[PDB]
């Protein structure tokens, strides 16, 4: 029924709004650390960065739990979905926080890093691809509810590997897909290609994430210690 789809759009939208501060509500602020030029790794910047990443992973687990039916999946499956889509979601998130004129990305506490800093923070040689994905996202002009539904679709995916009940996850995802097309089309009738464009972003995102995981391998050798436990949880996927 439509009321249910509408209900689903509102829930997800709020789940997302409540776990991911919009950019325009963020009290932006800066740092003067290695803004100068690129280097292998600025350890102060990496600490702040990984600390923010850890918190966003928890926020993501929170978001997932507010998605109808997630909590009804086996705990093994829930964990399986989180490990598999978490990096993808992190990517879509800072990328949706891109500011083209300043060429910066803003983290959840308002920390705004310029391209050199994101590099020094840890993205290293993957920075420009990240910024390139961010840029190629702007044309879509997705709103909060669309980014939330899309992240929900990235997460609830029955094609994951250790799924115990992949069929249950597919059925959970189904309404999310309906929700996104209905909403995307309603908000913009004149742009029929938005739904499929957004769906194709999922595949790109997954592409930048595998690269990001590979970036983590190298990163591990640059840091004078182990990466935060929640981040490692995510990387062991
Ligand atoms: C965590 C992490 C990585 C990527 C993080 C990304 C792609 C986004 C983080 C977004 C945050 C932290 C957003 C916010 O706070 O709003 C890379 C692949 C460099 C490897 C080391 C661990």
From Swiss-Prot:
Expressed in aortic endothelial cells (at protein level). This is Retinoic acid receptor gamma. Receptor for retinoic acid. Retinoic acid receptors bind as heterodimers to their target response elements in response to their ligands, all-trans or 9-cis retinoic acid, and regulate gene expression in various biological processes. The RAR/RXR heterodimers bind to the retinoic acid response elements (RARE) composed of tandem 5'-AGGTCA-3' sites known as DR1-DR5. In the absence of ligand, acts mainly as an activator of gene expression due to weak binding to corepressors. Required for limb bud development. The keyword Oxidoreductase does not apply. There is a cross-link at residue 220 (Glycyl lysine isopeptide (Lys-Gly) (interchain with G-Cter in SUMO2)). Residues 4-237 form the NR LBD domain. Keywords: Cytoplasm, DNA-binding, Isopeptide bond, Metal-binding, Methylation, Nucleus, Receptor, Transcription, Transcription regulation, Ubl conjugation, Zinc, Zinc-finger. It is found in: Nucleus; Cytoplasm. It comes from the Eukaryota. One of its GO terms (molecular function) is nuclear receptor activity. GO terms for biological process: anterior/posterior pattern specification; apoptotic process; canonical Wnt signaling pathway; cell differentiation; cellular response to leukemia inhibitory factor; cellular response to retinoic acid; embryonic camera-type eye development; embryonic eye morphogenesis. Composed of three domains: a modulating N-terminal domain, a DNA-binding domain and a C-terminal ligand-binding domain. One of its GO terms (cellular component) is nucleoplasm. Belongs to the nuclear hormone receptor family. NR1 subfamily. Homodimer. Heterodimer with a RXR molecule. Binds DNA preferentially as a RAR/RXR heterodimer. Forms a complex with PUS1 and the SRA1 RNA in the nucleus.
